[PDB]
Write a protein that binds this ligand. Sequence first.
Ligand SMILES: Nc1ncnc2c1ncn2[C@@H]1O[C@H](COP(=O)(O)OP(=O)(O)O)[C@@H](O)[C@H]1O
Ligand SMILES: Nc1ncnc2c1ncn2[C@@H]1O[C@H](COP(=O)(O)OP(=O)(O)O)[C@@H](O)[C@H]1O
Ligand SMILES: [Zn+2]
Lengths: 247, 626
Amino acid sequence: SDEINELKEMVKDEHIYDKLVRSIAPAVFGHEAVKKGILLQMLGGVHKSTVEGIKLRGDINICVVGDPSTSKSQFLKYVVGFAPRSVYTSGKASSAAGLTAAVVRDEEGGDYTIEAGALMLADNGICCIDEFDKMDISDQVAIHEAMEQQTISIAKAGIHATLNARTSILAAANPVGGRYNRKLSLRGNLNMTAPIMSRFDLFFVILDDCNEKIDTELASHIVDLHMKPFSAEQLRRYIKYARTFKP
Amino acid sequence: GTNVSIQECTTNFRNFLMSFKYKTDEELYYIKQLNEMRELGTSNLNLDARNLLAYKQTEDLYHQLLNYPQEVISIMDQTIKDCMVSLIVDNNLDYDLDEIETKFYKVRPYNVGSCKGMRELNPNDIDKLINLKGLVLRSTPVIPDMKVAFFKCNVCDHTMAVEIDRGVIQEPARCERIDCNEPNSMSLIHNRCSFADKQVIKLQETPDHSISLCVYDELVDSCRAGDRIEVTGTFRSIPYKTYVDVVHVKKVITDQDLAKIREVAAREDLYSLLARSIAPSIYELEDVKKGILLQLFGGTNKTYRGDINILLCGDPSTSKSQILQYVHKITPRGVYTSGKGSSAVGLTAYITRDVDTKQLVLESGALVLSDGGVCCIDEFDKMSDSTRSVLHEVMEQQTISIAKAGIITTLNARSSILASANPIGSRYNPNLPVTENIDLPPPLLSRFDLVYLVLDKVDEKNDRELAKHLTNLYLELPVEFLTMYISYAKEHIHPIITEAAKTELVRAYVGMRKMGTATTRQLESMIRLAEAHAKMKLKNVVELEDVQEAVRLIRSAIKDYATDPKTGKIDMNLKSVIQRKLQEDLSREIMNVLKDQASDSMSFNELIKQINEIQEALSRLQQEDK
Ligand SMILES: Nc1ncnc2c1ncn2[C@@H]1O[C@H](COP(=O)(O)OP(=O)(O)O)[C@@H](O)[C@H]1O
Ligand SMILES: Nc1ncnc2c1ncn2[C@@H]1O[C@H](COP(=O)(O)OP(=O)(O)O)[C@@H](O)[C@H]1O
Ligand SMILES: [Zn+2]
């Protein structure tokens, strides 16, 4: 009952959705839209199976783009340090085989065996990639099947299985020109092609300006980091309950 | 024979254990600790072995003990139990003795005098007590070893307890029962025995090359990768591989030096003297002296690191290689690297699995080897793009995350970076914006704390100033003090920014903000440099004077006053009518304030503070007799 009441106080309160957004990476100032977006990504939708046999994705993919001053890697660090299952990786460091699946020769026999890549690890969780625009196109392609079908298909050297890849991809990247070329439009500043853009259910571009009223507050509290609603443990307890409802 | 006498040595230590003091410093050392040891629920003592060289007879024991360390320690174990029993029940100070009496203890000297180094040892020096130092790299998993063997008679189920002596297994020939006496009936049960932990830890040893250490019992997994280590153990080579049976491991100046430090700390020309003394070969460059010096002082580390990094955007003929080559020597030992001759693997690492250890092993690259220190990256403009991508996470989290085939892990490479970069082309071109003279992307160019534009001008007057400095230097503070100062400052001072210093940062940053490339990256420099200045000052808080001077240093390093706010170009020259009017208006007001006060004159110090909230203007008035 005490566990029930503690978990209940985070559900049956009239402002909980407002409260929980302000409880995502409290060190990062501003960017109130991404705090809603990630929180929704952390509660991915209902998986459905058609009476015809087709299955429907329930997880949510999110991409974030900002200038090199806008703190975006902090969000990925928070997610990988908070999520039940999570994996952190970088754009240039990662590779196709390391992300999806590794074909490795197995012991106790002469036949191959899969090794869990980055996506297979933290399955039914959130996968995080930093500096997404730095990734090669040829190894960005390998994420495509996992982003929508939530499966990995392998046909390489005597292996033909299909593997569960129910993962919510979270990514961060920077515009093609380093800074946001504010002369142009959103259509021209991103090198991400149409297919990958369509898959991301949410897509944020956050910009910075020389507004004094904002910078004074921004400088005020980032200094407090170097000077020094619901707790971070409460959110996992709430999510372990919320993930059950199927509206 | 044995240099150790069973009764002589225990008597000699007994005198030491009850009479030792260092020279309130007069209090005896172990007269206090003996009660504390009886309080402890521990099973061993890390003996303060530096006391052995602090007392006369103990050093004589050390030389005698140099070839027989095991026997005394075994005697001390019983002595410790006897000392416990005597202090508990014989002194009647305690009564909990049952577990202590039955169990076994050990003793570990930790600060014995070091030997003549590893490679200088000799075949007779094998099995002798030694003291070494090094860096731990890799650890093997827990390997159990036999201590007790469990035998059951396969025809009558009788059980024997057999213990190994000197690494020998003795198989019973017949069952010990009176009736059952079948030969060879005794059988061994693998999982009814008793085992002890054995671990092999790899150390990169620097003699007073890498040596594979060995640990046992509670000493296993106490040493992990990257630990800074001093070794107190036994050099071993047995029929022949060189290894050390570690007995204890350590996980890690005069008052006259303190007087020497304070003299430089007190003198007013501190900053002037440091610039004058840091680089005799390099002339002037006051800010560049302040720049690299503040890199070596570093900011405070909180959990937010103080790894100040600097870019030298100077012309490609100013002595900057003459600096960073010299920096690599004067600084506490780091690594000298060139961006042209380095790669992502060369800087970070090569990581692979091991069949024996069954966990990831690392081959440290250039960047990781500088963990906690300072590294120099020449030819930064020529670094490969893949390698440059590494620095983004390095200069934001000091970590590197790798996710490739079969390997998914993150490392730590906390270090300071000193970067020098020639301008695009054969020389700097001020006719172009500064951000276009530098071949670095804005994301990478913004995260540097300090960028210095060192330009050489063809002036006959300034040529003689530099020329006569060098030409007489090659005719015919020391580095020891300088390193002693820096190590002292890093050791003690952890300044905290005051309330007054905090508020001034807001106006300083906003002023650069409204003139826009003033990202929040440069706000990191507005605290990192502030702490490093107080640390040089040895003041345990960051002063507002440190704040404003550091802001000026950033301004002077980037040359904002000589930079066009419109297109970012630089003035070549950096009597005017604006100078005239300011002097005219200043002179007009001085003539009033000097006489508006109810006196014919006043002190010029008070007059300056009255109007500045000047000497030339009043001198001209004196020339005109006003
Ligand atoms: N809203 C904010 N709250 C706290 N810190 C911030 C904020 N915005 C920027 N920062 C600071 O500025 C830096 C921005 O770096 P970041 O944009 O994460 O680099 P990268 O582009 O490599 O991810 C961060 O280290 C962060 O500490
Ligand atoms: N201000 C200076 N002080 C001392 N030596 C200088 C100075 N300017 C140039 N030099 C000399 O010019 C030569 C050029 O070396 P340096 O500028 O350090 O690297 P680079 O040759 O790549 O430009 C050096 O041998 C150095 O002794
Ligand atoms: Zn028997």
